[PDB]
Design a protein around this ligand. Structure first.
Ligand SMILES: Nc1ncnc2c1ncn2[C@@H]1O[C@H](COP(=O)(O)OP(=O)(O)OC[C@H]2O[C@H](O)[C@H](O)[C@@H]2O)[C@@H](O)[C@H]1O
Length: 167
């Protein structure tokens, strides 16, 4: 049992809140926080940059070692690394960068990684700088993830639209 509070129920297993994922992670200290990564684990902005800053760059230092050993992730792929001061683990998941021509269908493959974890605190993959339509990302999440996922949506206007949309 985690201390997640104030979430709206979307389905049996998907919950959503208008909150900063960093704030939620700091408060709840979940087993798994999801990062919306790129294949190089270069955590520059959005969720990745905010999570990394909250770890005082430890996430990036660890990611540099991961890449030196293993090479880049696949689009739609993932790896499990430490959650540092935020969570037990961080699941780094790469959604497609639709703005750079990558196939939106890989967003389903990306969300499938969530099924390897019983409970996750997560963002909407690909819905920010990667350019996927946010409601599409939410619908893929709902239709793909079967484990318990707590979605933190930073943007208030976006949240209000998402929770008023069919799934
Ligand atoms: N602190 C936050 N808390 C919750 N949601 C957030 C936060 N910041 C952004 N969002 C929302 O989270 C959603 C995802 O936005 P993005 O983080 O861009 O992820 P992507 O998968 O599209 O792009 C991946 C790149 O982003 C990084 O640069 C990586 O290093 C990658 O190169 C949007 O709805 C945001 O409003």
């Amino acid at each position: 049992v985690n201390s997640f509070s104030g979430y709206l129920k979307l389905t049996d297993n998907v919950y959503i809140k208008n909150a900063d994922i960093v704030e939620e992670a700091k408060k709840v200290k979940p087993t798994v926080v999801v990062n919306a990564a790129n294949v190089y684990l270069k955590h520059g902005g959005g969720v990745a940059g905010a999570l990394n800053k909250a770890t005082n760059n430890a996430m990036q230092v660890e990611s540099d070692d991961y890449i030196a050993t293993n090479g880049p992730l696949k689009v739609g792929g993932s790896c499990v690394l430490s959650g540092h001061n935020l969570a037990k683990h961080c699941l780094h998941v790469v959604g497609p960068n639709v703005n750079k021509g990558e196939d939106i269908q890989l967003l389903k493959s990306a969300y499938e990684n969530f099924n390897q974890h019983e409970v996750l605190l997560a963002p909407l993959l690909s819905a920010g700088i990667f350019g996927a339509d946010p409601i599409h990302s939410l619908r893929v999440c709902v239709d793909t993830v079967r484990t318990n996922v707590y979605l933190a949506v930073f943007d208030k206007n976006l949240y209000d639209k998402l929770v008023s949309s069919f799934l």
